[PDB]
Amino acid sequence: NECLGTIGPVTPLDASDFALDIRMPGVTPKESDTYFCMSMRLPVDEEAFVIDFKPRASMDTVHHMLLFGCNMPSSTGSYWFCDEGTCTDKANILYAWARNAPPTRLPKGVGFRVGGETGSKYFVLQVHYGDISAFRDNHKDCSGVSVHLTRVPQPLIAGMYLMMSVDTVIPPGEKVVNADISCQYKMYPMHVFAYRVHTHHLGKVVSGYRVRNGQWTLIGRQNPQLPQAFYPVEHPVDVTFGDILAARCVFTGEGRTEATHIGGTSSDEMCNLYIMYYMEAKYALSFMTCTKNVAPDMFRTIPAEANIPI
């Protein structure tokens, strides 16, 4: 999509709403699978709500797009290679765009709280470019996301419950290495309405469940090699004080000469389930994390679908 120029990135939509265009500053790559990142400081310092997203991606070149909220983007630069990292602090993912999988809208009345004393101060946009053949004419690129914000407080607040492995070790050649993650949920009810899975090249399947009175309700189950959008939850899932959240990524060691651990680089691995929820405004918190596996013996009664690939 076109570069803005003289009109700037902020469009007022009315007295209390405005659209913010986060775009690449006319960038040109040189190699394939290049990863680019930029930051936008929120224009308002007071609290606001991300109520909508609109992708502005040149359909030829872009593989996927990710947008985060954080307070300390990795580079105080115009743009940068995301191998240097996205944020110094916790990067809160808000929006994922996939080529072969068109995203879903936020439910009306649900919004991410940003800015203010506690909300994110910056957005970080990440654009993964696939094929770089589109630069034979040599145009610059301004692909990115147009985000809808409002000062109007939303009755429901969007949030992110991130489940992720930290201690996994994938022995070389090994056929099946499971990565389990489990936490007991101790907040006010949330309603999970979407999930995204993340793995590197060795993941076979990733699936998260709710365990309430020792019974596994499925949140999401996905092949991590399939374009990593936020897919919507079939039937929306409440999670309540007492419930336990459980995720397993399934990995293979085949075609690897040396053991693989959890890490940044592509020759490393990751086991991330991004459970995306909403809560009642007055009870909501914006981000939760599980990096533990507190109920490991519980994983014996896991459904057998979680072990076969989709």
Q: Which is nearer to Cu ion, 66 or 114 (CB)?
A: 66
Residue 63 touches which of Na ion, Cu ion, Ni ion, none (Cβ within 5-8 Å per kind) = Cu ion
Catalytic residue among 200, 228, 276, 288: 200
Residue 64 touches which of Ni ion, Na ion, Cu ion, none (Cβ within 5-8 Å per kind) = Cu ion
Q: Which residues contact 136 (CB under 8 A, 6 or more apart)?
A: none
Task: Give dist(CA 51, CA 72) in Å, integer.
Answer: 23
Task: Give dist(CA 271, CA 181) in Å, integer.
Answer: 9
Catalytic residue among 40, 64, 154, 163: 64
- Minimum Å gap between C-beta 100 and Cu ion is 10
Q: Which is nearer to Na ion, 82 or 233 (CB)?
A: 82
Residue 88 CA, chain-centre distance (Å), reads 16
Q: Which is nearer to Ni ion, 198 or 210 (CB)?
A: 210
Residue 261 is assigned to a ligand binding site:
no
Interacting residues toward Na ion by CB under 5 A = 82
For residue 72, list its beta bridge partners.
none
Q: Which is nearer to Cu ion, 88 or 267 (CB)?
A: 267
Residue 139 is assigned to a ligand binding site:
no
Q: Is the dihedral of CA 127, 9, 230, 281 positive or negative?
A: positive
Residue 235 is assigned to a ligand binding site:
no
200 is catalytic: yes
Catalytic residue among 40, 191, 198, 228: 198
198 is catalytic: yes
Residue 128 touches which of Cu ion, Na ion, Ni ion, none (Cβ within 5-8 Å per kind) = Cu ion
Polymer length of the chain: 310
Interacting residues toward Ni ion by CB under 5 A = 238
64 is catalytic: yes
63 is catalytic: yes
261 is catalytic: no
Out of 63, 90, 121, 212, which residue is the one contacting Cu ion (CB under 5 A)?
A: 63
Q: Which of residues 168-227 bind Cu ion (CB under 5 A)?
A: none
Q: Which is nearer to Cu ion, 24 or 270 (CB)?
A: 270
139 is catalytic: no
User: Could you tell me which stretch among 34-42, 59-67, 234-242, 291-299 binds Cu ion (CB under 5 A)?
Assistant: 59-67
- For residue 2, what are the CA distances in angstroms to 21, 31, 65? 11, 22, 16
Pattern of binders to Cu ion over 267-286, x per CB under 5 A? Answer: ---x----------------
201 is catalytic: no
Q: List the binding residues for Cu(2+).
A: 63-64, 128, 198, 200, 270
**Binding stretches for Cu ion (CB under 5 A):** 63-64, 128, 270
Task: Tell me which residues are annotated as active site.
Answer: 63-64, 126, 128, 198, 200, 270
Q: List the binding residues.
A: 63-64, 128, 198, 200, 270
